[PDB]
Design a protein around this nucleic acid. Structure first.
Ligand code: K
Ligand code: K
Ligand code: K
Ligand code: MG
Ligand code: MG
Ligand code: MG
Ligand code: MG
Ligand code: MG
Ligand code: MG
Ligand code: MG
Ligand code: MG
Ligand code: MG
Ligand code: MG
Ligand code: MG
Ligand code: MG
Ligand code: MG
Ligand code: MG
Ligand code: MG
Ligand code: MG
Ligand code: MG
Ligand code: MG
Ligand code: MG
Ligand code: MG
Ligand code: MG
Lengths: 196, 132, 49, 565, 101, 312, 171, 88
RNA sequence: UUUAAGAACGUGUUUAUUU
RNA sequence: GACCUGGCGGUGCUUCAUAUCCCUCUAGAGGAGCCUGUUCUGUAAUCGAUAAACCCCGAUCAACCUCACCACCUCUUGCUCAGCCUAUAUACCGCCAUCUUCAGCAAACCCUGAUGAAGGCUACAAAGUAAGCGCAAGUACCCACGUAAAGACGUUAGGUCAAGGUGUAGCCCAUGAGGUGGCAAGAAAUGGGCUACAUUUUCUACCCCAGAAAACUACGAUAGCCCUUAUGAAACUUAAGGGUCGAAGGUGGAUUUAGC
């Protein structure tokens, strides 16, 4: 005769089991696997919400059954061997900007699809205060005239944004190179400067 | 009168599903979305290619599982992966379901150049929300 | 590329793996018009000359 | 994470209707999913143009059509090499003659690459998606033809030709071709010597004493040509010695000791060829016991890597040894070695996996406590293997030994969920155990609720070719279980089936029917008990009838009873 | 197997405009300046005007990819207002819902 | 229809699923209340649907399934109640009991409370009721109160009365703060249209106001705007006694004044008597003005205006 | 194109024109009505024109204890399958065309004198297998409504009897 | 993992657009749609390359359906060698 | 008891285990 | 001849309409110029909408393209296991207009009328009980308000075969396909809108404490003419700007629209 469906394996489950073993990774809602009488849907007049069996509304939900607190705490316990310790010396931000005066910004974008490319990932920004650089009166006055609107007098920060080249490693090099020719030309003094 | 995605009332002998019984003005109040991706978010791209893939998938699976789908599909994208979640009937033999799962999972991976996985949930008969 | 989409699923239909309910419709109508006499003529040898 | 005991292997669809119940479904369901992947690859490689469009970034080479056809249509030296990389035996050989006929110089590294393609497949085309007994090697083949055409022959030429003959059971011819190698002042490699050891034994079915001397000669030649043996060289020796179960026992250890001498770590296949040899269909098994205990201590706490193709066949055999020895403390070490690191991958294919867990679990129920035997039944089944009808029996014979017959109503449910709903032998051993002795009301009512399900299986049977047959013991047990429980009404409806199928009812079933009638005080029913046994001419009936006549019987019925006999 | 000939003609136009995109680019650079001589700019005016008509990008039309409709097309999805609503009204477009405020 | 046996099987699935859900989240199954279930179901099954009755729910079957009447006749077929054939045995058994207590009285001789509503009476009686039936029952209850009802009668009538939470239209005073110098002040916020203002009112001052660091007469050239700033202080006769320092952002010329007027008034409520705060409320000085710009509609020129209509 | 193809329910719903302005007020002759046909009735999953045999779908998975491989029917054998599919189609269709000679009453097109069978069984175990029902008059009556206009309603007169003195009629 | 984290909810953005209701004419009657984009910013502090390599991979992999991410990384560097002193 | 206030072409709208 | 139902009544009584009928409030339309649509005329030279419920409508859009039109020329198993913007919206799906700025539609049972078409209420109650749909309730926007959305069954054989799809019919050396070039105008009438006729105005500064202008060099064109620029392969033609020009117009007939 016709093939009959077996009873759901939720009945064999115990209460004091290990849930992470059932839903280790992200997977759709399987009513034959989740031992919960969860219901979903807008009820009709004098009715009750639809049950999990055959429910499409529960399939639309991006559940978090694979990310229970028990798993998270158990997942991170196994990931502490990949991590490194942060220097205790660099406690505050004022101490971070005394030994590392340059800050590099770079953004990465995560989107669905078969292609991972994004043209917004090439941009690189470099910020550095002029008080951390070995400049004199002349050099500092000249450097602020070359960069133009890249320097903010309110914060004394030089901002260099590079998006010319395809890759992000090239724009980083370009920004460092730009910071170098600016520092050196600022120190160099030319004859025309006398006609100020 | 308005007609879009509305199942007109009848004597009371017509069965309808939950999604088929709610109109477009319930899509975020009593229904969800059958496709979930990042294309239609602010500042994101490739919303047009993800839509052509969806339209083709719903037809590929309608003709690949003829008379077996109990309700609309649910397409899900997590990065490179593509998860197809379907509710099917129990008339066909399991021998033939496993054949079509491997045939479709493979054929679509080489077409769209992405790992594809298909999740079936069998029901004895088409679930009925109410009778119109 | 509509060639790929249409040629792919045309081939899968001759292979028995894709069922096009739309071709079946117009294939059944085009079969009933031959019994009714409304058949497409031979090219070149048409009603006109 | 750990394995989920309530689930089936990941590869299957987690759905009740799609879950494989029996062990046949488990294997036939993956062969169909493998068949759909093959039907799609056929379509992908037959119509590449539809799947050439690549939208993936980064590029995914494993998701692009493969091109098996030659593209260089010209006749040249580079055009033949492309047909040798695609393993085109027929095209390459038919095109090699054209290149040779033209007179163009053919490099020796190119003609040697054609022999490898021919010596391996034996002048035959590989298997493709779509277009045992005897000796595959043939005299009228291209392998020997082209071998003569060659104007110059190096070591590799003979090395690759000797190995192609031994592979196709041409042992006798390989030895004749090896004599020419020594005549040309040449030296073979390790691989060629490895195949030469197989030809020695397989060529002739002589006594071991002669074979042992023969093998030692090749070894002395291997050391006389500056050739160092490998793991395979030693493995063939043990695999070959299997035929001589008794005699080769001591020679085998010497081979093992030799492997240790040269610092060659025995793999799993090496130990596999030893236990098979020492293992023999004998009752004492004194020698086999001592060997395996030593091997485990060596293998204990190790992680293995693939070295020999037969490394997987170790675990299946070792378990069989413990089952033949009936030693459970040793099976915990063999199975405890299979979980360490990543050694769980050496268990082997399904058929090897199903057999492993059968000998293993069947030895658990027999030996260990029942409270521990039931913890292994929840873990293994169904997550690891699907049981066979025999395992359910052995498990039932353990509950009897532990006087825990309250679990029987659950072992019958699981059997039907594993495809044993219509196993005659199984249903004939579950009923007898339940009806063997009287039990309290609460426990006696459960066996009947399960006996009613075992009865329904007999009524509905998949095979309609033959008429429905009810075993004598079955009908004897289904009816007595209704009485003890209290289902008297249903107990009298089975009486017609006894004579209907010419099945003899036991006296214990008739003797206990008395109380049922006496409690009712319905003489009519009492006569029905007498009438049935009288039909079968049972001696207990005549003596029984008199007692019934004394206790409860209508006057008119007493006279009729005697005449019916 | 495209929807109609109107669609097929635009596919060809987008293909010819992709082949001459660089050649047309290099010539216009000469014309779009006041540095080079007029005599040379006059020769480039004749070289790019002798290129095939379908190579001009202004002759391209953003039609619907499902119905070949020239007007009422949303550029982000490349669909017509009638097809977009058919998919949005059935909940097949992620995030698309009806607005009320 | 849902039988008594079916409900009893749903009670057992909730109890077991209530113990699984605590094993997932790492909680104690014993001390796992219904508030923790709703929080755990919202993490595992996140739904942002605007309707809360369409989200995943795991509640007790006695709160999901609607209450159903018990069977009214036995095996023999005789009903259990003598008013069965009326169709409203519960409603009429109540009216018969009340009318019987009104006969006894004749022989031997509210602010928070609100009469039970119709929809709440059907649940008690598990019966479907009309409107005119509800009014008849309410008329007997009121008639019962007028008479010298006994102690036992009051308890009965209190089964059909429901308490009411009476809100208080009393402005909330702000906590007076102290600065480094020691001056007392109070801060509040106002909002008019898109303008949003934060005002700091010092307890003692010489009537100085500074908006965004600018004296008020310079920031508000228009007289009407300055009149608004004067209204809070003039109403309570406190002109030239406090110093204000506010910061308004957004909106337009007149919207910033109304936003500032509201904040100054709210912060001025801490340095005045309760009777004055009530007067400020009855004058419209403590109320946020909800009148905001209305949206334009498609097919219309404006929010309410229509396109020119042509009959032919 | 492949994206301009609808489903059968959409193709038939439009071709039949069952719900239209013509159907509402007797604006369509019933002499040539279009009849729906199910095109998936005699179609098998895995069968195509090329004659391919896909193991697990079109043909058994294993044959003689061994898994089959991909095979394609021959031209002669594949043409014999197409002609055999036709016979099952026409035969199936023929049955529907075949009309049963329903026992007429007083006249061929009249309703009087026609039997309706025994009444429906009651819920509390009541049956009327001994009763026979026969129609006496079928009249089409109308009433004018504000929105639709002419509202057609059917008036029927029947009689039941057991053949033993018990009889009754109703409307 | 021992990381400092601060969470804030940026204002949402709603992009709307209107379309004709009918296939032909009936201009006055249109349908309005919207896409709602909601944000959630997680500001971490004082990390290393390895810790971020793990945490990001952990949460990027479990990024649910319909959820994008913009990870802005602020690196600390030191003055290059050429910047220490001038050459002229 | 209370100003005036015309006209609208002709048909068609209901049944049957390795070995 | 007598009736049922509905419709209609320059039919009665009573109660009402809330930006709605009257009276009553505010700004407009109808007059001029310009922009734009339509109708007529014209042209070798599209189609469709076209009382309310068409007329900056299909178009959130036409210099070529788009484009389906015209003339000329060219191809024939044709980008498609062909094709057709060919006829039929009075064969249809699909998406809608309209009453709706409504609240009713109605399965299944019962009863009345002598078992007619039909009808079915009185609360100090006289035969009605009623699933379901809609309304309502809920939800969205800044709430409990309001605005959106929603709004059934049906009515106007209302709109659309030219979104796409499709039944019937018709074409297949042409009613199909492609190329080049070209028409899309104004005697005339009219709808909608823009700018104005000015002093509550015009110009400049400012973004509200100013100075000038103020009737034939004022107020007043987004028009014309000329030049330049932007886009583009291509611009008397599209847009922007400048120069030149300084017209009608002096608050508008019957009538008429919107707004709490
Ligand atoms: K006017
Ligand atoms: K005018
Ligand atoms: K006008
Ligand atoms: Mg509408
Ligand atoms: Mg264009
Ligand atoms: Mg306005
Ligand atoms: Mg007749
Ligand atoms: Mg006349
Ligand atoms: Mg007339
Ligand atoms: Mg026109
Ligand atoms: Mg027309
Ligand atoms: Mg028309
Ligand atoms: Mg208009
Ligand atoms: Mg044109
Ligand atoms: Mg042209
Ligand atoms: Mg044409
Ligand atoms: Mg016509
Ligand atoms: Mg119509
Ligand atoms: Mg509306
Ligand atoms: Mg509503
Ligand atoms: Mg019409
Ligand atoms: Mg002037
Ligand atoms: Mg001008
Ligand atoms: Mg130019």
């Amino acid at each position: 005769p016709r093939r009959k469906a077996l009873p759901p394996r939720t009945e064999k489950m115990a209460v004091d089991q290990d849930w992470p073993s059932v839903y280790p990774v992200a997977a759709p809602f399987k009513p034959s696997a989740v031992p919960l009488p969860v219901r979903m849907g807008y009820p009709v007049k004098k009715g009750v919400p639809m049950a999990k069996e055959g429910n499409l509304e529960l399939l639309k939900i991006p559940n978090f059954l694979h990310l229970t607190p028990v798993a998270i705490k158990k997942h991170c316990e196994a990931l502490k061997d990949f991590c490194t310790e942060w220097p205790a010396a660099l406690d505050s931000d004022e101490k971070c900007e005394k030994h590392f005066p340059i800050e590099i910004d770079s953004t990465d974008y995560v989107s669905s699809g078969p292609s991972v490319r994004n043209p917004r990932a090439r941009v690189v920004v470099l910020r550095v205060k002029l008080s951390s650089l070995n400049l004199d009166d002349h050099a500092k006055k000249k450097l602020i005239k070359l960069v133009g609107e890249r320097y903010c007098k309110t914060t004394d920060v030089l901002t260099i944004k590079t998006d010319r080249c395809p890759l992000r490693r090239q724009n980083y090099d370009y920004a460092v190179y730009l910071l170098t020719v600016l520092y050196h030309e600022s120190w160099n003094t030319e004859e025309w400067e006398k006609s100020k | 009168k308005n007609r879009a995605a509305r199942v007109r009332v009848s004597k009371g002998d017509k069965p309808v599903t939950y999604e088929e019984a709610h109109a477009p003005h319930y899509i975020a109040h009593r229904k969800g979305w059958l496709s979930l991706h990042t294309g239609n978010l602010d500042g994101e791209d490739h919303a047009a290619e993800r839509t052509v893939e969806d339209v083709f998938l719903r037809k590929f699976m309608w003709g690949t599982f003829p008379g077996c789908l109990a309700d609309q599909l649910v397409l899900k994208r997590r990065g490179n992966q593509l998860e197809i979640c379907a509710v099917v009937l129990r008339q066909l033999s399991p021998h033939k379901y496993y054949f079509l799962v491997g045939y479709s999972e493979t054929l679509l991976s080489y077409f769209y150049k992405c790992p594809v996985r298909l999740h079936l949930q069998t029901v004895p008969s088409k679930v009925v929300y109410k009778y119109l | 590329n509509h060639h790929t989409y249409a040629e792919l699923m045309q081939t899968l239909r001759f292979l028995g793996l894709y069922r096009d309910e739309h071709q079946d419709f117009m294939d059944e109508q085009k079969r009933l018009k031959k019994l009714r006499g409304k058949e497409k003529p031979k090219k070149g040898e048409g009603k006109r000359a | 994470v750990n394995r989920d005991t309530t689930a089936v292997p990941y590869v299957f669809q987690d759905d009740p209707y799609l879950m494989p119940a029996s062990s046949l479904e488990s294997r036939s369901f993956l062969l169909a999913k493998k068949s759909g992947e093959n039907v799609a690859k056929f379509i992908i490689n037959s119509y590449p143009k539809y799947f050439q469009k690549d939208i993936a970034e980064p590029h995914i080479p494993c998701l692009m059509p493969e091109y098996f056809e030659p593209q260089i249509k010209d006749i040249s030296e580079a055009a033949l090499k492309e047909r040798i990389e695609l393993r085109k035996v027929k095209a390459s050989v038919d095109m090699f003659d054209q290149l040779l006929q033209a007179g163009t110089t053919v490099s020796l590294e190119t003609t040697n690459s054609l022999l490898d393609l021919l010596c391996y497949y034996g002048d035959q085309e590989p298997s493709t998606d779509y277009h045992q007994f005897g000796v595959t090697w043939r005299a009228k083949n291209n392998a020997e033809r082209i071998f003569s055409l060659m104007p110059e022959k190096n070591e590799h030429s003979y090395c690759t030709m000797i190995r192609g003959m031994v592979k196709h059971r041409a042992y006798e011819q390989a030895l004749n071709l090896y004599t020419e190698l020594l005549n040309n002042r040449l030296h073979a490699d390790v691989y060629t010597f490895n195949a030469l050891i197989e030809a020695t034994v397989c060529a002739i079915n002589e006594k071991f004493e002669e074979k042992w001397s023969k093998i030692l000669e090749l070894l002395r030649h291997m050391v006389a040509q500056k050739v160092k043996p490998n793991l395979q060289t030693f493995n063939t020796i043990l695999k070959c010695l299997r035929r001589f179960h008794v005699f080769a026992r001591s020679p085998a250890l010497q081979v093992l000791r030799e492997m240790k001498a040269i610092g060659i770590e025995p793999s799993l296949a090496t130990y596999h060829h030893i236990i098979r040899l020492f293992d023999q269909p004998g009752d004492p098994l004194k020698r086999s016991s001592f060997i395996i205990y030593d091997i485990m201590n060596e293998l204990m706490g190790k992680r293995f890597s693939p070295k020999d193709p037969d490394d997987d066949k170790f675990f299946q055999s070792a378990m069989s040894i413990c089952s033949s020895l009936r030693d459970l403390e040793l099976a915990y070490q063999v199975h405890g070695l299979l979980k360490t690191g990543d050694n769980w991958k050496f268990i082997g294919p399904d058929q090897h996996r199903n057999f492993y867990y059968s000998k293993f679990f069947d030895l658990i129920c027999l030996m260990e406590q029942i409270d521990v035997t039931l913890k292994w039944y929840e873990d293994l089944i169904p997550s690891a293997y699907f049981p066979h009808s025999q395992t359910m029996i052995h498990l039932l014979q353990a509950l009897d030994v532990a006087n825990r017959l309250e679990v029987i109503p659950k072992i019958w449910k699981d059997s039907k969920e594993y495809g044993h709903t219509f196993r005659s032998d199984l249903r004939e051993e579950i009923l007898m155990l339940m009806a063997r002795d009287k039990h309290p009301p609460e426990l006696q009512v459960a066996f009947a609720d399960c006996a009613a399900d075992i009865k329904s299986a007999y009524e509905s049977q998949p095979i309609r070719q033959t008429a429905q047959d009810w075993p004598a013991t079955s009908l004897n047990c289904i009816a007595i279980l209704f009485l003890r429980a209290g289902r008297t009404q249903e107990a009298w409806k089975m009486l017609g089936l006894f004579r209907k199928h010419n099945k003899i009812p036991r006296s214990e079933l008739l003797n206990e029917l008395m109380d049922s009638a006496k409690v009712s005080n319905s003489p009519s029913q009492a006569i029905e008990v007498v009438e049935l046994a009288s039909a079968f001419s049972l001696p207990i009936c005549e003596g029984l009838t008199q007692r019934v006549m004394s206790d409860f019987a209508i006057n008119q019925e007493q006279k009729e009873a005697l005449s019916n006999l | 197997h495209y929807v109609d000939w109107r669609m097929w003609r635009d596919v060809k136009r987008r293909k010819m405009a992709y082949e001459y995109a660089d050649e047309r680019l290099r010539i216009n650079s000469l014309r779009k300046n006041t540095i080079l001589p007029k005599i040379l700019q006059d020769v480039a005016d004749e070289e790019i005007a002798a290129l095939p008509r379908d190579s001009c990008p202004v002759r391209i039309r953003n039609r619907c990819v499902m119905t070949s409709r020239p007007r009422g097309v949303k550029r982000r999805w490349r669909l017509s207002r009638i097809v977009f609503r058919h998919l949005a009204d059935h909940g097949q477009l992620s995030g698309i819902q009806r607005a009320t405020w | 229809t849902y039988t008594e046996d079916f409900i009893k099987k749903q009670i057992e699935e909730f109890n077991i699923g209530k113990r699984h859900l605590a094993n997932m989240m790492g909680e104690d199954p014993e001390t796992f209340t219904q508030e923790d279930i709703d929080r755990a179901i919202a993490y595992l099954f996140p739904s942002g649907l605007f309707e809360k009755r369409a989200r995943p729910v795991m509640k007790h079957p006695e709160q999901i399934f609607p209450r159903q009447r018990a069977i009214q006749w036995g095996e023999d077929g005789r009903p259990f109640h003598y008013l069965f054939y009326t169709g409203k045995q519960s409603y009429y058994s109540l009216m018969h009991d009340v009318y019987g207590m009104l006969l006894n009285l004749e022989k031997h001789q509210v602010i928070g409370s609100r009469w039970l509503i119709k929809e709440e009476l059907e649940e008690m009686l598990v019966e479907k009721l009309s409107d005119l039936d509800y009014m008849q029952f309410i008329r007997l209850l009121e008639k019962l109160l007028t008479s010298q009802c006994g102690a036992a009668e009051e308890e009965f009538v209190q089964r059909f009365r429901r308490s009411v939470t009476l809100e208080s239209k009393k402005q909330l005073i702000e906590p007076v703060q102290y600065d480094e110098q020691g001056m007392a002040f109070s801060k509040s916020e106002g909002k008019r249209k898109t303008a949003k203002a934060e005002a700091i009112v010092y307890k003692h001052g010489s009537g100085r106001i500074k908006v965004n660091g600018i004296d008020y007469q310079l920031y508000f050239p228009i007289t009407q705007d300055r009149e608004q700033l004067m209204f809070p202080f003039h109403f309570v006769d406190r002109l030239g006694k406090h110093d204000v320092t506010c910061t308004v952002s957004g909106g337009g010329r007149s919207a910033q004044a109304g936003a500032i007027r509201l904040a100054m008034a709210k912060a001025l409520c801490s340095f005045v008597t309760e009777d004055e705060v009530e007067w400020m409320r009855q004058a419209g000085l403590l109320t946020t003005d909800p009148r905001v710009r209305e949206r334009k509609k498609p097919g219309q020129e404006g929010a309410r205006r229509k396109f020119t209509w042509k009959k032919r | 194109s492949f994206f301009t193809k609808l489903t059968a329910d959409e193709l038939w719903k439009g071709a039949l024109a069952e719900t239209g302005a013509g159907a509402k007020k007797g604006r369509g002759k019933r002499t040539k009505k279009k009849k729906r046909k199910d095109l998936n009735r005699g179609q098998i999953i895995g069968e195509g024109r090329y004659g391919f045999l896909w193991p697990g779908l079109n043909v058994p998975l294993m044959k003689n204890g061994a898994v089959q491989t991909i095979a394609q029917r021959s031209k002669e054998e594949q043409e014999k399958v197409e002609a055999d599919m036709i016979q099952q189609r026409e035969e199936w269709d023929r049955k529907k065309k075949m009309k049963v000679k329903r026992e007429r009453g007083w006249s061929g097109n009249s309703w009087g004198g026609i039997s309706l069978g025994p009444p429906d069984p009651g819920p509390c175990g009541e049956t009327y297998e001994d009763f026979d029902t026969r129609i006496l008059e079928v009249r089409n009556v109308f009433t004018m409504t504000a929105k639709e206009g002419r509202k057609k309603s059917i008036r029927v007169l029947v009689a039941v009897g057991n053949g033993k003195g018990a009889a009754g009629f109703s409307i | 993992l021992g990381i400092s984290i601060k969470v804030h909810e940026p204002p949402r953005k709603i992009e709307r657009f209107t379309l004709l209701q009918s296939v032909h004419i009936y201009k006055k009657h249109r349908v309005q749609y919207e896409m709602r984009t909601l944000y959630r910013c997680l500001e971490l502090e004082h990390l290393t390359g390895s810790t971020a390599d793990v945490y990001l991979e952990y949460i990027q992999r479990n990024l649910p359906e319909g959820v994008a991410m913009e990870v802005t990384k602020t690196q600390l560097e030191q003055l290059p060698e050429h910047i220490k002193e001038p050459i002229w």
